[PDB]
Amino acid sequence: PKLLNKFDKTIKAELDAAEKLRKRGKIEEAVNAFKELVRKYPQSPRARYGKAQCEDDLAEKRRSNEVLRGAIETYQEVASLPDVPADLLKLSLKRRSDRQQFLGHMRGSLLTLQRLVQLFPNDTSLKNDLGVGYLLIGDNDNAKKVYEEVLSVTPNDGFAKVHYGFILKAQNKIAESIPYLKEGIESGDPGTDDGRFYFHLGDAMQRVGNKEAYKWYELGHKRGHFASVWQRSLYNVNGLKAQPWWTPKETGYTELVKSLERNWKLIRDEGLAVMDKAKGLFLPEDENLREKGDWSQFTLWQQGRRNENACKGAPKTCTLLEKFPETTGCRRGQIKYSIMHPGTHVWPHTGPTNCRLRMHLGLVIPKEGCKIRCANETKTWEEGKVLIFDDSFEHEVWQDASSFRLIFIVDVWHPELTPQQRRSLPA
Ligand SMILES: O=C(O)CCC(=O)C(=O)O
């Protein structure tokens, strides 16, 4: 790196020393070092970069946002100093942009990336990063405009390609997006080996019915992005038994299964009564996972918090679940009624965590046409009986019956999580 300017050049013995007290883990000595040099050598750009770098790490150690803000201003100050090395300038502002992104000053970071591109119009790597600035604030139109400029000069930049495909996919151009995602990943370009882009590729493919997408999930696994080709949840705890379908006995939560099966008509009636007397408390489910049809849910507990307004509506049922904190205390689950109507298709998808099991109590199940697949096994519900699967495995759902299907969904902690784990995990 061209990081010693003439202005700064002639202090290297002193400059280098500050670098040693930092590199030795004595940033406190090191921070205070450079500061004097700012006093002593005020215009040195390298004297001001190091300052920022000291307090940047000083912020890492103290884990302090406020301190880090200090460093962000100081990285900037480098850029004001006159007669600065280009290599050094780039370094300080790139880091500023990133530390700003870290703290969530997304538009502030975008503003810095805008500068960096004015100052290095032939650095396509910075144009790439600018595109990310735009995505991070929601301006996909300008992000699209950026990757098109890159790709017009750099036809084969895979970073630009995978982001370009993301963007297309996000504008509902699913099929156009797939070759971009494939080519950008295949390039192995830096930044393309990202779990996010296998996810969107395989999704897109699944949504255009191309079978080749499991190949890509399987690769994401062998790259470490997915627990397996089927188990693709993000927030995971290692060493939890991973199987798609479970039985009551296998989970140990047999008392819960029994309360549910045995009082099932009561659970049904209180949901059926909400459909009648307050249809509005069923909200539509994920429009993103709903290919077509009518699919709605009525939540009682979300992430171990009882919706108090909802237990007024189905009171005995809430009373029943109070006896079972493996579910009501599942900070990584919900407890909800779910109604699917004819002509509904739920795209393949997985849940966010392997730290819960999903139980489904059948309440109103048409005698034909409702099925659910989890990994390679497809099954159907029975009124009054309970299914259990690990919704961190890809699952998919169809409603091709002639009347409505109502179920009751009940998340439990994954049975192998210990008490201290259940207490400590964030939701
Ligand atoms: O309501 C349903 O049948 C869909 C369930 C589902 O996709 C899920 O439980 O994660």
Numbering used by the authors: 331 to 757
Quote the study on this structure.
To enable comparisons of how 2OG and the 2OG derivatives bind AspH, AspH was first crystallized in the presence of 2OG with the natural AspH cofactor Fe(ii) being replaced by Mn(ii). Clear electron density corresponding to 2OG was observed; the C5-carboxylate of 2OG being positioned to form a salt bridge with the side chain of Arg735 (2.4 and 3.0 Å) and to interact with Ser668 (2.6 Å), which is part of an ‘RXS motif’ present in some other 2OG oxygenases. The C1-carboxylate of 2OG and the 2OG C2-carbonyl group complex the Mn ion in a bidentate manner (1.6 and 2.5 Å). Two water molecules also coordinate the Mn ion (2.1 and 2.4 Å) along with the two anticipated residues His679 and His725 (2.2 and 2.1 Å). Thus, the AspH:2OG structure supports the proposal (based on the AspH structures in complex with the 2OG analogue NOG22) that the active site metal, when bound to the natural AspH cosubstrate 2OG, is complexed by only two AspH residues rather than by the typical triad of ligands (HXD/E⋯H) found in other human 2OG hydroxylases.
Aspartate/asparagine-β-hydroxylase (AspH) is a human 2OG oxygenase catalyzing post-translational hydroxylation of Asp/Asn-residues in epidermal growth factor-like domains (EGFDs) in the endoplasmic reticulum. The human 2OG oxygenase aspartate/asparagine-β-hydroxylase (AspH, BAH, HAAH)13 is highly unusual amongst human 2OG dependent hydroxylases, because its Fe(ii) cofactor is complexed by only two residues (His679 and His725) rather than by the typical triad of ligands (HXD/E⋯H) found in other human 2OG oxygenases. AspH is of significant interest from a cancer research perspective, because its levels are upregulated in invasive cancers (e.g. hepatocellular carcinoma and pancreatic cancer) and it is translocated to the cell surface where it can be used as a diagnostic and prognostic marker. Thus, the combined crystallographic analyses reveal that the C3/C4-substituted 2OG derivatives bind AspH in the same general manner as 2OG, with near identical binding modes for the oxalyl-groups and the C5-carboxylates.
